[model samples]
Target chain A: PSVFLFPPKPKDTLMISRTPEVTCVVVDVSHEDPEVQFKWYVDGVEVHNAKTKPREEQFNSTFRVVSVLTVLHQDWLNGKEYKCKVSNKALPAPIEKTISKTKGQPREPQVYTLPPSREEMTKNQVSLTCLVKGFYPSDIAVEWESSGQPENNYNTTPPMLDSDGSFFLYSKLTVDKSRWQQGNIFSCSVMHEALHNHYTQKSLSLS
Target chain B: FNKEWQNAFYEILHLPNLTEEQRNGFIQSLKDDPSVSKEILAEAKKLNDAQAP
Candidate 1:
């Protein structure tokens, strides 16, 4: 009676992104029905914050759904295991996918600090760029300081994937050209689990 | 609507301080009540507006 009810389908996949503030986990799954449900689990316990988007129609008569789960930075750093379970009426059992930061080894990051261009310094404002690269597990903390005082006016991008299976990121600090002209010491300090001392700082100043 | 607003929406939904119970309740309210979702959207819009020059 039910001949074409269930067709063979591939399992879902999980991806992870992290920052000092949060860790984002995403699961992508495709199913014949649009009413698929997603659930998140942490160390075998269910977490209730997972959100699934509306299913998208695909040409193959199947629908694709994306689910997102956000974990606190502390939870991820503490090495918690995460799982995504996908279910639909067609499946006899839910599809489960798990991820953990412990599966990958950490690699030290290299920080490169770039001072504002000379031309930009001639203008009213300038930007100091800090490039941190070649790190594993994605999470990294970057701070900016000027003349010994902590600076909060900066924009740090989310971790970007690297070809070598590591990660990279950029942090930019905006300051008045007058501050640069005054020869204020600007430094970009980085902290990651991979480093020897788990910290590094690079400073720059005008001559 | 905008990228900034989308980011703010997720940031609001994923505040680090909320406990598991509170977080689940908040998300459920946002889903079940249009007014609650509107309030969150308003908050996220303010964040996006503040980023403007």
Candidate 2:
């Protein structure tokens, strides 16, 4: 029912984690077999402690499989390369996908401030967006401030991968329409390891 | 806290040397306590700086 598609030979996998000491890499693949297998490696050495879940049947009758490889954060920081190898009885050979840390090379994000569109504006409330793009290493911090004080009523998105292997993210802030129109200053500040100052900010106001 | 800062501070949270309860308390403090977040950020920054080339 499904092509023996080993699609996206090297797909854009993800690095998931919370603490600096631990981290996870997610590998996704699809096939027609329910018994697909997974193997993980760090710098070519086989890895243990990886978890693989049962395949879920897709609408096209193909099976979607996902594997998670947990690694020490220090290993990635040490510039180690990780590989996920997928094997199945239906295929003649196994498929391998790899991910590695970006050494020494870091790219700064381009920050943009988007004021509320006229159509999105309301008599009672308004929203502003901060767009951050084209950054590397995937570690960043975004904060919203009103008149130089931190404001908690804001939402920021997780880092997403771009085609160029960089990262992008967004943050939105909501406030009273009256306050927004009253020329109150709202600023979105970002911090990253790539920046010389380790910070960048954009502000918006309406008069 | 922003996702960026939260993720940055998360590095300090899982050092592999602490017990599970200690790690759990650190995350709980991040949500219920403000000073803990600040301290985490400061330490995270230092770690970032040390690793930068």
TM-score of each: 0.46, 0.47
Off by more than 4 A, model 1? A1-42, A45-79, A83-99, B1-53
- Highest lDDT, which number? 2
Worst 10 residues of 1 chain A by lDDT: A1-10
Candidate 1 lDDT, A99-185, residue by residue in tens? 654435567889998888777756788999999998865657788997679998999998765433356899999998888888888
Candidate 2: deviation at residue A75, Å?
2.9
lDDT of 2: 0.64
Candidates' DockQ values? 0.01, 0.01
